[PDB]
């Protein structure tokens, strides 16, 4: 799995898409996405988000490399029922340049 | 390497049940969905359904609802299909196949389990027609095999190759992209409702039957196949 590079102090607009989460079960089952980790649901909270129905990772705010250089988050894929379909997927986000 | 070992041939009387195993190895069993398919002599292929071994969610072709029961044993990396209320019409070769990619395709297949025995609903069922059933060409030639869908399937079209073994391989998924280990001389194209597979420099290895399959909508459906001699 490849890290996502985001230049610091981007113009936006925000929120902006960064990368789309894909499961190899997507063709078979309608998959809903959520994220956790420092940057999403623990501090700093709400910097990153995800579009539940599409899997598109969103960045809500411009990133400052002097504050935080790197983020490690977890993607979660569930069915309509709420049943998990995968182990948590690791999401690495590096701030450039 | 990725392997799916299916259990031995079955010979049962009408009215009985039977249960086939499909043992996975060479990958993380729960990270991929497992699909089953039926092939009646000689070569027609029908999609039964799939199980997600992680969640346990199952989806059946309305056709096999009640006839087939899919389960898994996580601790042994084994998928199971039970077939009930058996009749002569259930006599077929049955297959295990792994869901390979986000864009579709079944990337690895078991060798098949032969069953000899001495259902339907309101979903629309996309018809895949391969207009040529049998084709004879020479060694070294280039040859085009065609496939048509009753509906626009937006490039979700895959091609499989079956040898007179029974063994099946994925050649191409999502219209044009090649499964690993598949030589460049196989290539596919198409759009909307019309698709085709092109093989160049025919070899002895290519004597086989080639099947298209749509991955746009449930239930999954296959074409009737095109047989290739010399
Ligand atoms: Cl593969």
Instruction: Give the domain-ending residue among B124, B147, B173.
Output: B124
Question: CA B214, CA A24: separation in Å to the nearest integer?
Answer: 17
Question: Per the domain annotation, does B230 fall within a domain?
Answer: no
Q: Is the dihedral of CA B51, B57, B63, B64 positive or negative?
A: positive
Contacts of A84 in chain B (CB under 8 A): 54-55
Three-state SS string over A24-87 comes to CCCCCCCCEEEEECECCCECCCCCEEECCCCCEEEECCCCCCCCCCEEEEEEEEECCCCCECCC
Q: Is residue B32 part of a domain?
A: yes
Q: How far, CA to CA in Å, does A66 sit from each of A8, B107, B146, B174?
A: 9, 45, 58, 43
* CA pair distance A61, B112, nearest whole angstrom: 53
Who contacts A47 (Cβ-Cβ below 8 Å, separation ≥6)?
A39, A40, A59, A60, A61, A63, A71
Contact A83 B101 (CB under 8 A): no
B229 located within any domain = no
Tell me whether residues B57 and A79 touch, CB distance under 8 A.
Answer: yes
Chain B residues with at least one Cβ partner in A under 8 Å? 31-33, 50, 52, 54-57, 59, 99-104, 156, 215
Q: Which of chain B's residues have a Cβ under 8 Å away from the Cβ of A27?
A: 99, 101-104, 156, 215
| Phi then psi dihedrals of residue B174, to 5 deg | 50, 55
Give the three-state DSSP class for B74: helix
Q: Which of A83, A22, A89, A75 is nearest to B51 (CA)?
A: A83
Distance CA B86, CA B6 (A): 20
**What is the rounded CA–CA span in Å between residue B60 and residue B58?**
7
Q: Residue B27, exposed/middle/buried by CB under 10 A (0-12, 13-18, 19+)?
A: middle
Give the nearest partner residue to B55 out of A24, A27, A85, using CB atoms: A85
Q: Looking at residue B160, which CATH number applies to its domain?
A: 2.60.40.10
| Beta strands A4-7; A89-96: pairing state | parallel
In a domain, B209, yes or no: yes
Tell me the three state secondary structure of residue B201. coil
Q: How was this structure determined?
A: X-ray
Residue A15: which of A56, A64, A57, A59 has the closest Cα? A59
| Residue A28 touches chain B, beta carbons under 8 Å | yes
- Set out the domains of chain A in order of their start, with CATH numbers: 1-97 (2.60.40.60)
Contact B206, B199 (CB under 8 A): yes
Strand partners, B162: B168, B209
> What is the whole-number distance in angstroms between the Cα of residue B26 and the centre of ligand 1?
11
Q: Work out how many domains chain B is built from and give that number.
A: 2
> Do B97 and B23 fall within a single domain?
yes
DSSP collapsed to 3 states, B19-48: EEEEEEECCCHHHCCEEEEEEECCCEEEEE
CA–CA dist B115, B91 (Å, integer): 5
Q: Quick check: A40 and A46 in contact, CB under 8 A? A: yes
Residue B228 lies in a domain: no
d(CA B62, CA B46): 12
Instruction: Map B203-215 to HEC letters.
Output: CHHHCEEEEEEEC
User: Taking a C-beta distance cutoff of 8 angstroms, is the pair A35, A50 a contact?
Assistant: yes
CA distance B222 to B5: 23
Resolution in A: 2.5
Domain for residue B2, yes or no? yes
Final residue before a domain boundary, out of B69, B95, B124: B124
Last residue within a domain, chosen from B102, B124, B146 = B124
CA atoms within 13 A on the CB side of B178: 11
Beta bridge partners of B147: B195
Question: Does B154 lie in the same domain as B141?
Answer: yes
Same domain for B108 and B142, yes or no, is no
Same domain, residue pair B7 and B114: yes
Q: Are residues B130 and B120 in the same domain?
A: no
* Cβ count within 10 A of residue B204: 7
Cβ within 8 Å, pair B215-A79:
no
SS3 assignment, position B220: coil
Whether B143 and B209 map to the same domain: the answer is yes
Helical (H) or strand (E) element with B169: strand B168-173
B143 and B194 belong to one structural domain: yes
Q: Does residue B176 share a domain with residue B88?
A: no
The answer to whether residues B161 and B59 belong to one domain is: no
Coil, strand or helix: which one is A95? Answer: strand
Q: What is the rounded CA–CA span in Å between residue B58 and residue B52? A: 6
Do B66 and B89 lie in one domain? The reply is: yes
- Considering the domain boundaries, does residue B100 fall inside one? yes
Domain extent, residue B20, equals 1-124
Is the sign of the CA dihedral B113, B117, B120, B126 positive or negative? Answer: positive
B114 and B11 part of one domain: yes
Judging contacts by C-beta atoms under 8 Å, the chain A residues touching residue B50 are: 28
My answer on whether B218 and B148 are in the same domain is yes
Q: Counting Cβ atoms within 10 Å, is residue B1 exposed (0-12), middle (13-18) or buried (19+)?
A: exposed
């Amino acid at each position: 799995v490849a890290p996502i590079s985001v230049p610091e102090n981007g113009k936006g607009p925000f929120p902006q898409r960064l990368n789309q989460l894909k499961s190899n079960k997507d063709r078979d089952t309608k998959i809903f996405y959520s994220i956790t980790g420092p940057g999403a649901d623990s501090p700093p909270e709400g910097v990153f988000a995800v579009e539940k129905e599409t899997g598109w990772l969103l960045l809500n705010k411009p990133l400052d490399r002097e504050e935080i250089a790197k983020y490690e988050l977890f993607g979660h894929a569930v069915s309509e029922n709420g049943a998990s379909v995968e182990d948590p997927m690791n999401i690495s986000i590096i701030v450039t340049d | 390497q990725v392997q799916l070992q299916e259990s031995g041939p079955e010979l049962v009387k009408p009215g009985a049940s039977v249960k086939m195993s499909c043992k996975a190895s060479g990958y993380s069993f729960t990270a991929y969905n497992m699909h089953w398919v039926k092939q009646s002599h000689g070569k027609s292929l029908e999609w039964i359904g799939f199980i997600d071994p992680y969640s346990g969610i199952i989806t059946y072709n309305q056709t096999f609802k009640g006839k087939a029961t899919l389960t898994v044993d996580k601790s042994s990396s084994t998928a199971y299909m039970q077939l009930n209320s058996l009749t002569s019409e259930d006599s077929a070769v049955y297959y295990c196949a792994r869901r390979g990619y986000y864009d579709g395709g079944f990337d690895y297949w078991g060798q098949g389990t032969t069953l000899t025995v001495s259902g339907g609903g309101s979903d629309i069922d996309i018809q895949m027609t391969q207009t040529t059933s049998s084709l004879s060409a020479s060694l070294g030639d280039r040859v085009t095999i065609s496939c048509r869908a009753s509906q626009d399937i937006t490039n979700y079209l895959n091609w499989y190759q079956q040898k007179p073994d029974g063994t099946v391989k994925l050649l191409i998924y999502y219209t044009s992209r090649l499964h690993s280990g598949v030589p460049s001389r196989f290539s596919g194209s198409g759009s909307g409702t019309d698709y085709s597979l092109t093989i160049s420099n025919l070899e002895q290895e290519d004597i086989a039957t080639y099947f298209c399959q749509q991955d746009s909508k449930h239930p999954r459906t296959f074409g009737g196949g095109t047989k290739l001699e010399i």
